[PDB]
A paper describes a structure:
Vγ9Vδ2 T cells—a major subtype of human circulating γδ T cells—respond to multiple cancers and infectious diseases in an MHC-independent manner; they are specifically activated by small, non-peptidic diphosphate metabolites called pAgs. The sensing of pAgs in target cells requires a surface protein, BTN3A112–17, that has both intracellular and extracellular domains. Here we show how—in both humans and alpaca—multiple pAgs function as ‘molecular glues’ to promote heteromeric association between the intracellular domains of [name] and the structurally similar butyrophilin [name]. The [name]–pAg complex functions as a composite interface that directly binds to [name], bridged by the pAg molecule at the centre of the interface.
There are two [name] [name].2 molecules and two [name]-bound [name] [name].2 molecules in one asymmetric unit. The two [name] [name].2 polypeptides constitute a homodimer, basically as found in the apo-form [name] [name].2 structure. [name] engagement with [name] forms a composite interface for direct binding to [name], with [name] positioned at the centre of the interface. The Pα phosphate of [name] forms two interactions with [name]: one hydrogen bond and one salt bridge with Arg477 ([name], B chain), and one hydrogen bond with the main chain N atom of Val511 ([name], A chain, at 2.9 Å). The Pβ phosphate forms a hydrogen bond with Thr510 ([name], A chain, at 2.7 Å). To test whether the [name]-mediated [name]–[name] association results in Vγ9Vδ2 T cell activation, we mutated [name]’s Arg477, Thr510 and Val511 residues, each of which directly interacts with [name]. In contrast to wild-type (WT) [name], none of these [name] [name].2 mutants associated with [name] [name].2 or caused Vγ9Vδ2 T cell activation in the presence of [name], indicating that [name]’s ‘glue’ role is required for γδ T cell activation. We generated a [name] double mutant (D455G/E457R) to disrupt the interaction of those residues (Asp455 and Glu457) with [name]’s Trp350 and Trp391 residues and found that these mutations significantly reduced the extent of [name]-triggered Vγ9Vδ2 T cell activation. Notably, we discovered a significantly enhanced binding affinity of [name] (KD = 46.8 nM) compared with its affinity for [name] alone (KD = 1.64 µM), a value much closer to the observed cellular activity of [name] in γδ T cell activation.
Author numbering:
A (entry chain C): 304 to 484
B (entry chain A), C (entry chain B): 322 to 521
D (entry chain D): 305 to 482
Write the structure that this text describes.
């Protein structure tokens, strides 16, 4: 644990799909009912309901924590700087995304090819994300009871990696980064 | 400008007569008479106040556009297109001269352009009606979407200003539904086997 | 480019398998096998030589597009979307990895992406089927146009090249019809009392 | 002869994309589907109309049109400044003085409102007479000389073109007698 530097992760509004609302403090993200009137600048995801952090990882060991609370739909992890941001692409390691999450309230998945269903004994409310750049590892943990959720050992170690967050649903609970602390 | 646009019609709540009750998604509406009884309703120049009408939020100044409306089990109703400039406060005849192009159900009869002199000899109850607009053609047309058969085209008219989808209910607690445009799996996870029989 | 396009689909006779018999308006098709008996049919590179298929003449490289097909009393049919570049020659497999996105009626059942492992549990006989494309979404969806209900969305795919309307007939003397886009009174005199129950 | 016979040639720059002007610019037919032509200012982009090349600014003129047994056609004249972009109702007040045939046997004058005409015989050839200064336009059966209609005492403020309109895809073309 101690080997993993807490990352200070802030959402980059220039990257957020127009249907996303980034809080003023750049820590939380909700969905709008309908897309907002924003420029389609090159940084922005124009199809996937995604937003990146401002800072990318290029070396070292890093940790951040995400409050998912009782949200019924969310996906998080990292993605390469060079991912396709315009039009649908499958969010999988081969297209530069390393993400997992929840759909339909109780169906936890790893977003790989093909998708697999994850066994979670407890619904997590807080997810810890551990990245070891050099060993191409990203691991997901229940940040409350410390239990393991899923690991990728095939993360790029040649591309800058952004934290990435995705929400499809319109619901009360935001998705919130716990600030470096 | 050559494409037929299948419009996604969402109702504008600022236009809606106070007795109209909109669904949360603003794609369906029923009339609930005197539902503001004992209330003071605020002034709003966009609101229809003499007849129970509501507009689509979309306006059209050119092009070809259509949408579909489910009217099964409503038997006092008016649909079509109106100018954005139509009278909202006083009661007008819902006729082309006043900026309205409509198909009406009234006392068990289908009336073109809301006219007692234009009874449509239909041989079945309409369930889904297509409202078709060709701005440059001065064309508002109505279709029976059971077999996609033409019902009526209004006398050609210079629309001249932007026009809007127009809805009116003359009756109580029976809703009309405005058929959303097809979206496929927009906003939804498609599993790797496909998405089977999706329901909202 | 956010607009749903209601496509006016016309079949491309150059793609048509020689057993297919197009109407002169090219909006309907039936299969009459050995109808070129004793004839040398030119086998141009665009033509399907084994699969009894025909493409729409339209191709799409972006945006949202749909069309409707009448399939009532046809026991063997396929509809959908295919890449402009699909293999035309031999017994090509009509699957996504070969650039075909289909819904099929085969032996009284409905099958997605022409797969025996993807029988769709519909509770009614399809009569009018909607074929929907969202190019940037990788989306081909099918609709039951009786109630506009979702049937199936294929696994999301990178189309990569332009795609076209795809049709297959696996039975004889049973025509499918492609529903013309609505046109209102286009090309027709509208009398000053309106045009009533136009037929052609 | 009280009217200078006009030499009317169809201006393909004015023809709706759905119309086919012959090689010699004297006859017009309908295509199945619009051709790919530019939307130059002179072209009728909605009505299925085509103008003559020459407009009339004074004097007395006539020309004759073979209608054949065509079930649909309208002809006459219109002002130079008529709306060519989008539908406008073809009426004197919008700058159109026209008459013709719809649905095999129904003859009208394109007035506000339209008026049905009672024609003893169906004409295969029609004569159009214009007198700029009086403001008269008249239509005649050109084989047997019968009157069809006259617009009386119009106050023309614009050059007038011969105008031709066909809606139906039929075998009989519409042809200007040279
Ligand atoms: C609509 C949408 C995402 C769904 O993508 P997909 O349909 O590719 O599904 P998955 O990535 O497996 O959840 C917006 O980000
Ligand atoms: C479709 C069409 C014209 C019909 O115009 P209208 O529908 O205004 O009828 P008419 O009374 O014949 O002038 C194309 O020129």
């Amino acid at each position: 644990k101690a080997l993993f530097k807490p990352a200070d992760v802030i959402l980059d509004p220039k990257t957020a799909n127009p249907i996303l609302l980034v809080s003023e403090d750049q820590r939380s993200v909700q969905r709008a009912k309908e897309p907002q009137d924003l420029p389609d600048n090159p940084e922005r995801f124009n199809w996937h309901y995604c937003v990146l952090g401002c800072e990318s990882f290029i070396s070292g060991r890093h940790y951040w924590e995400v409050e998912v609370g009782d949200r019924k739909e969310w996906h998080i992890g990292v993605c390469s700087k060079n991912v396709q941001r315009k039009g649908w692409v499958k969010m999988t390691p081969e297209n530069g995304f390393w993400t997992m999450g929840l759909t339909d309230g109780n169906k936890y998945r790893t977003l790989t090819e093909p998708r697999t269903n994850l066994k979670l004994p407890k619904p997590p409310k807080k997810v810890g994300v551990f990245l070891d750049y050099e060993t191409g590892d990203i691991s997901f943990y229940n940040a409350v009871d410390g239990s393991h959720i899923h690991t990728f050992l095939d993360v790029s170690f040649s591309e800058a990696l952004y934290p990435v967050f995705r929400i499809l649903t319109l619901e009360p609970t935001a998705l919130t980064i716990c600030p470096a602390l | 400008r050559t494409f037929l646009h299948a419009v996604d019609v969402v109702l504008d709540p600022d236009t809606a007569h106070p007795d109209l009750f909109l669904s949360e998604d603003r794609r369906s509406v029923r009339r609930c008479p005197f539902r503001h009884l004992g209330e003071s309703v605020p002034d709003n120049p966009e609101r229809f106040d003499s007849q129970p009408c509501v507009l689509g939020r979309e306006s059209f100044a050119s092009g070809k556009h259509y949408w579909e409306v489910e009217v099964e089990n409503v038997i006092e109703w008016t649909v079509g297109v109106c100018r954005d400039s139509v009278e909202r406060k006083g009661e007008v005849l819902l006729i082309p001269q006043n900026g309205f192009w409509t198909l009406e159900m009234h006392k068990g009869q289908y009336r073109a352009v809301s006219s007692p002199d234009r009874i449509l000899p239909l041989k079945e109850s309409l369930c889904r009606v297509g409202v078709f607009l060709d701005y440059e053609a001065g064309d508002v047309s109505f279709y029976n979407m059971r077999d996609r058969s033409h019902i009526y085209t209004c006398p050609r008219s210079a629309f001249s200003v932007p026009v809007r989808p127009f809805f009116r209910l003359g009756c109580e607690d029976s809703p009309i539904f405005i058929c959303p445009a097809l979206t496929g799996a927009n906003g939804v996870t498609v599993p790797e086997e496909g998405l089977t029989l999706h329901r909202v």
